[PDB]
Structure to design on (1055 residues):
RNA sequence: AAUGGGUAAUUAUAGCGAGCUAGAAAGCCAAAG
RNA sequence: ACGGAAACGCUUUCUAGCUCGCUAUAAUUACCCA
């Protein structure tokens, strides 16, 4: 679960907990995870974040159902993304959305993850 | 037709005249100048001034001396010719007394058609609110605009007011809206309005044309300079100067 | 009334892809007839959760199975006997040339890029994309716009000056803005039957091969007439947008002598009208000032996928034969090589 | 005498338009240029200020003989239909350009519309180094129509200024169909049609038989 | 930390601590930081300063949490905004909001930064 | 060689951030007495 | 047998007029990995 007073901090300590290149000592402290595979995760929720303001949640939630499978499939391809969705409890927070103010907190939490990943690296 | 349609009332008083008459001459010498002849000539000097020369000072001006004598001048009239009257009266009285004998007036603005006791009492309250500034002060129009005359006639009425008039007549872009927004930033004035004024004048520096831009730069580096002066005797003067410039150009 | 309107007509010789940003993944289509069916996967998962098999679906999505015809969500529906396919999105017919392997590999395409579509759902060409094709023809064929358009010794040879072409409000000055005065309209929204999804085929110099790529963008079919309206409110703009006929020929002449030479001429099309390179797959040299980016374009690549020496790999595709446009065998088009003709109205 | 008339129209979009919004609390990878929209229905509006300042400037390049160089230098055919700030008799300006709200939301819902505004991705190709810069700007969709109110005053200063100002208002509307209501314009985004031009009097007595014929010029 | 007596002075001395363009003599001592990378950050706090005057603090904690995301993200993109929000301790001023009064204090601090950015150069 | 797949970068950049006009009048009162 | 009794700081008055969220900007590049 992530709420308003802590989700940015949860994202901050998530990004610090992703593992790095232990080898490859050419500009070290570099993540396995990259900017492209993380913006592919933010692009899943970037449509639903601005469809949430206009539409009702009850006429929208099948996309929120399918977006769990989207995060699963984007996790099941690279080990640097399956690592991310378990460090930051993304799959655990997708099940606990259930309204608009947590949809616009999860879609905002992904923005926090991208922001701290861009900030570190 | 430019000028606000108000009339002013000024009430004056030479500060500490009885002290300047009894003791008076006791400081120079060793009590050797404290005669009756010195006090008699002093009475003739003060009587000569306040009973002869005030009519000379009120010659061209649009006013009425309701009383003059002793050390009081109570005078109603037009407000340009009341402020000019009292600046002229003191700048002649401190030449008359070599800079001894401070006088301390209260000017109050009043609209037309207002009763004369409701007018004179509010002038006399400004006069006594200027008695207790330190001693020597003019109290323009209100309880807060209370300036020492040496801090008023030089700074406000001749330095700042002529700089404001000189800037605001040699241009066409800036108008009275700019003067009103300066009066607000001068009157409220926390530390935040120093930053807001630094932003406002820098916005308007790059909005004026390139013909008049050093003209505006030498005005904003002159207004921001006294706004952020940290002596408090330079920001309060600018508000009274801008009040007088708005009162001069009222339609 | 200096609104001098024109009427551009655009004939696609090569397949043209534009836009939309998004892209369907590997498990988001259905190839069971000779068409590709791209559903609304939200309605797919909604109507499939009645089938009580969403956990087996989630098993299928992370299934790292070989034999790629069994990975592409066709075999998931054929094995588990889901046969309704009444879902949202749309269908497009095949190119026929996508799977190079005649051994089965049918619908074994992997990741298609979507085409730009309005909210009705119909494809069109946006005017902002056609204006970027006009603007490079105008930039390269004007010698005053090619000299200092460069670094000025700031960073990593970084960027265009963006101020050679005099643009701005420009406080104190009059209002020029040449490309505000070149007003390009969006096209009429054409039909879904013009889209084929050509793959990608990178054809190199100094190693004569045509290695294909896993990037199969949903392009327009060749020989599709698409109309555009351009209004020019400045007479200075009217001169350039009238002289586009000379300038596109001059751009293609300076670009063939720079880049299409060192490639074999059989894979290279002929113009047949005035040439233009509409976006997504024409190469970097059609999107840039090509005679000013010779030591500056390749500097960005110190990676696994670098430009080879200089003047990077050619971008061919495979769409079927029409008219003939191809000039060779094996159907190598040029992916963005379109043509136009203009007339004032 | 006093009269007050009304111009009904339909602003049918043709390659629909962007009128830029306000929020800084947008996103990271979503719409950074919002369209203006109604704060309760979240339907796009055409605000009357963007109609007015396009008609005020497009007619300025037609009816001002001397080039304006400033507003309230207009040539008194525009100064009275829009209003100066500085002429003593032309402070108000006898036209009320009301805002326009999306009428045919059910007709767009009959078509396959996912959402009432589309999002358009528009990177800027750096003409050297070929790198990009994506913007995701929002625009109201193509076959949207907007109810266009327009209310005109007829006081005892209109001796023969009534029918003269209607070779001006419809002139400005047929110049809006050659220009673009703000947005980009040079990238599409503006072409409008004005449908069912229907003048009527909402207050007072005026004969709009002779007015409803030059609407159909 | 910023208090009610010194938040304008820190924004004064933080523009002066932000390093300028030492080279490239064409109007020199210009900032690396540009105006429009700074009006975007003020564009958040200005629309919180106008909502804090009406809405209660327990309704604005969705936007106040996202200021912490946006300053981090805009600093991660360009090094000049990083040099801003590390010189002016903005991420340590966002840590302390907790009510309406310190929120409006920070939102005035963000404006004093812009005012002194406009005033110098 | 086939067979499996895509991977990396950009997520808006530069601006304007409000300008100008009005800043209380007219009555009662006071004046006219 | 209260310098007191009686007495609305009251009436009239649009925060108003003018003002395009606008300007430039191909969702594009690279061709490869096991
Ligand atoms: N020429 C004069 N010679 C002597 N006494 C005079 C003269 N003119 C006026 N006075 C009297 O001097 C006294 C001064 O009165 P006043 O001005 O009230 O006191 P003050 O000394 O001025 N202290 P302040 O009222 O605070 O200025 C009055 O009684 C005047 O009548
Ligand atoms: Mg005295
Ligand atoms: Mg006295």
């Amino acid at each position: 679960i992530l709420t308003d007073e802590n989700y940015v901090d949860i994202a901050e300590k998530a990004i610090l907990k992703l593992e790095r290149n232990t080898r490859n000592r050419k500009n070290p402290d570099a993540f396995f995870l990259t900017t492209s595979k993380l913006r592919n995760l933010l692009s899943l929720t970037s449509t639903l974040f601005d469809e949430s303001k206009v539409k009702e949640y009850d006429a929208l939630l099948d996309r929120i159902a399918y977006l769990r499978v989207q995060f699963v499939y984007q996790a099941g391809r690279e080990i640097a993304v399956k690592d991310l969705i378990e460090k930051a409890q993304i799959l655990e927070a997708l099940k606990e959305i259930k309204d608009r103010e947590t949809l616009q907190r999860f879609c905002r939490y992904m923005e926090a993850l991208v922001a701290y990943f861009k900030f570190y690296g | 037709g430019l000028g606000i349609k108000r009339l002013a009332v000024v009430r004056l008083d030479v500060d500490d005249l009885g002290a300047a008459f009894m003791a008076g001459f006791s400081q120079q010498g060793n009590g050797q100048y404290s005669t009756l002849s010195r006090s008699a000539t002093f009475s003739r000097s003060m009587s000569l001034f306040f009973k002869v020369y005030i009519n000379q000072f009120a010659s061209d001006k649009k006013l009425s001396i309701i009383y003059a004598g002793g050390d009081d001048v109570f005078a109603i009239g037009s407000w340009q010719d009341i402020i000019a009257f009292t600046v002229e009266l003191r700048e002649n009285f401190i030449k008359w007394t070599n800079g001894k004998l401070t006088l301390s007036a209260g000017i109050g603005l009043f609209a037309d058609k207002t009763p004369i006791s409701l007018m004179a009492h509010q002038t006399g309250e400004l006069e006594e609110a200027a008695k207790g500034n330190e001693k020597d002060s003019i109290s323009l129009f209100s309880s807060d605009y209370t300036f020492k005359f040496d801090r008023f006639i030089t700074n406000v009425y001749d330095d700042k007011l002529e700089q404001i008039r000189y800037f605001f007549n040699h241009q066409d872009e800036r108008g009275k809206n700019f003067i009103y927004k300066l009066i607000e930033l001068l009157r409220n004035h926390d530390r935040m309005n120093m930053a807001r004024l630094a932003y406002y004048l820098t916005r308007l520096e790059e909005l004026t044309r390139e013909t008049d831009r050093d003209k505006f730069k030498t005005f904003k580096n002159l207004f921001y300079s006294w706004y952020t002066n940290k002596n408090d005797k330079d920001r309060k003067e600018a508000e009274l100067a801008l009040l007088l410039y708005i009162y001069e150009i009222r339609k | 009334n200096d609104y001098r309107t024109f009427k551009l007509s655009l004939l696609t010789l090569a397949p043209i892809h534009i836009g939309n940003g998004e892209k369907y993944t590997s498990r988001e289509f259905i190839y069971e007839n000779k068409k590709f069916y791209f559903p609304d996967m939200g309605k797919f998962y909604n109507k499939m959760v009645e089938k009580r098999l969403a956990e087996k679906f989630e098993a299928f999505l992370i299934q790292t199975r070989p034999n790629a015809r069994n990975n592409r969500l066709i075999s998931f529906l054929n094995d588990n006997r889901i046969a309704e396919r009444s879902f949202g999105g749309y269908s497009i017919s095949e190119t026929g040339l996508e799977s190079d392997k005649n051994p089965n590999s049918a619908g074994a395409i992997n990741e298609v890029n979507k085409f730009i579509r309005d909210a009705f759902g119909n494809p069109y060409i946006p005017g902002s994309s056609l204006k970027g094709a006009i603007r490079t023809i105008l930039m390269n064929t004007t010698p005053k716009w090619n000299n200092e358009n460069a670094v000025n010794d700031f960073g990593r040879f970084p960027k265009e000056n963006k101020n050679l072409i005099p643009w701005g409000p420009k406080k104190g000055k009059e209002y020029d803005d040449l490309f505000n005065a070149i007003r390009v309209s969006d096209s009429k929204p054409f039909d879904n039957k013009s889209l084929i999804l050509v793959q990608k085929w990178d054809y190199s110099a100094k190693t004569n091969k045509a290695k294909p790529l896993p990037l199969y963008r949903e392009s327009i079919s060749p020989l599709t007439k698409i109309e555009f309206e351009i209004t020019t409110t400045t007479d200075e703009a009217g001169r350039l947008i009238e002289e586009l006929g000379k300038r596109a020929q001059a751009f293609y002449k300076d670009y063939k002598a720079f880049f299409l030479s060192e490639f074999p001429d059989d894979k290279i099309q002929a113009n047949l009208q005035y040439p233009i390179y509409l976006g997504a797959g024409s190469g970097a040299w059609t999107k840039t000032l090509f005679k000013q980016a010779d030591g500056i374009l390749q500097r960005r690549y110190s990676r696994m996928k670098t430009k080879m020496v200089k003047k990077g790999v050619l971008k061919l595709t495979k769409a079927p034969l029409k008219t003939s446009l191809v000039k060779n065998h094996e159907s190598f088009y040029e992916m963005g090589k379109a043509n136009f003709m203009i007339k004032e109205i | 005498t006093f009269a007050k008339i009304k111009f009904s129209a339909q602003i049918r979009l043709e390659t629909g338009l962007h009128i830029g919004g306000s929020d800084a609390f947008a996103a990271i990878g979503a719409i950074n240029s919002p369209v203006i929209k109604d704060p309760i229905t979240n339907l796009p509006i055409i605000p009357g200020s963007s109609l007015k300042g396009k008609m005020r400037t497009l007619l300025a390049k037609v009816y001002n003989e001397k080039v304006a160089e400033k507003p309230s230098d207009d040539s008194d055919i525009l100064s009275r239909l829009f209003g100066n700030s500085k002429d003593k008799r032309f402070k108000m300006g006898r036209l009320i350009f009301r805002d326009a709200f999306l009428s045919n939301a059910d007709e767009l819902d009959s078509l396959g519309v996912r959402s009432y505004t589309e999002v358009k991705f528009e990177n800027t190709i750096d003409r050297i180094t070929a790198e990009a810069n994506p913007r995701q700007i929002e625009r109201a969709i193509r076959n949207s129509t907007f109810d266009f109110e327009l209310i005109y005053e007829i006081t005892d200063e209109n001796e023969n200024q009534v029918e003269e100002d209607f070779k001006v208002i419809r002139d400005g509307l047929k110049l809006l169909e050659l220009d673009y209501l703000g947005g980009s314009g040079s990238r599409g985004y503006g072409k409008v049609a004005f449908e069912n031009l229907k003048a009527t009097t909402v207050f007072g007595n005026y004969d709009v038989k002779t007015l409803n014929e030059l609407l159909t010029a």
Notes: DSSP finds seven helices and no strands in chain A.
